[PDB]
Design a protein around this ligand. Sequence first.
Ligand code: SF4
Ligand code: SF4
Length: 281
Amino acid sequence: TRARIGPEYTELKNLVRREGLHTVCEEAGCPNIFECWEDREATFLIGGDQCTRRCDFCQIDTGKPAELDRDEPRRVADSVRTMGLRYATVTGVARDDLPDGGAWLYAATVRAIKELNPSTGVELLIPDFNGEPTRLAEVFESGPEVLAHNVETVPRIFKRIRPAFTYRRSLGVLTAARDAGLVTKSNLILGLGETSDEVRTALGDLRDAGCDIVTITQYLRPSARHHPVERWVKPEEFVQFARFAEGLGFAGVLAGPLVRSSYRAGRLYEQARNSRALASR
Ligand code: SF4
Ligand code: SF4
């Protein structure tokens, strides 16, 4: 039942090792790596590992970012090409130190990946760029297969532990991406102190904002400096939340102990893609 080491994981590992490629998969010790790499899916981080913001559940440290590296989009595109990925997720940090909030860096990375990797689905997980319409438009024009912006938690909690964001602004990002014609995605992290009723209302908020794909996961505390875990969600409770989201009309729903945002991202995109094409007939 549990994924064990297969031939495509092995190929990818060999290619990563020789070229010295950085992946979030390896660097973060993600336990899904045997399964994801067997499906040739992987995740990359752009913009450095020092974020200009601080959200209490997030393992990324807050600090002074390094200078913009304009060679990073090519580096990521080359990694995707070397690995022969079927699906690639591009993540990053907030860059309030940059005058465009890093919008060029995100767009240029999607563009570079697509130039070299025509058959690779690309998922872009973005910060909010302060909801600035010109920044969002630059990013949307790069045309990722999935545009994700994770709200992570419910408004009561969001307000406190993501103080450089606002819940309605983040919903607005998803709406802007949907309006731009992109498949959209978000994530809820349970165990942060939210009530089940707050999860149900947040799923409704996400759907009404235009969100197509939602993941619902269990919080795993990064360290004793981070937010405490306030609940361990039972399998039957995840199933209820997934049914709730399915009933709301989300095209793709995954609930459970997913560990990271990118788990099964390729399969969820395929579901959303297929359902959109079916509806468009
Ligand atoms: S869940 Fe994400 S980070 Fe973990 S192995 Fe899969 S693609 Fe990589
Ligand atoms: S969730 Fe995003 S903005 Fe918040 S600390 Fe993590 S990387 Fe930075």
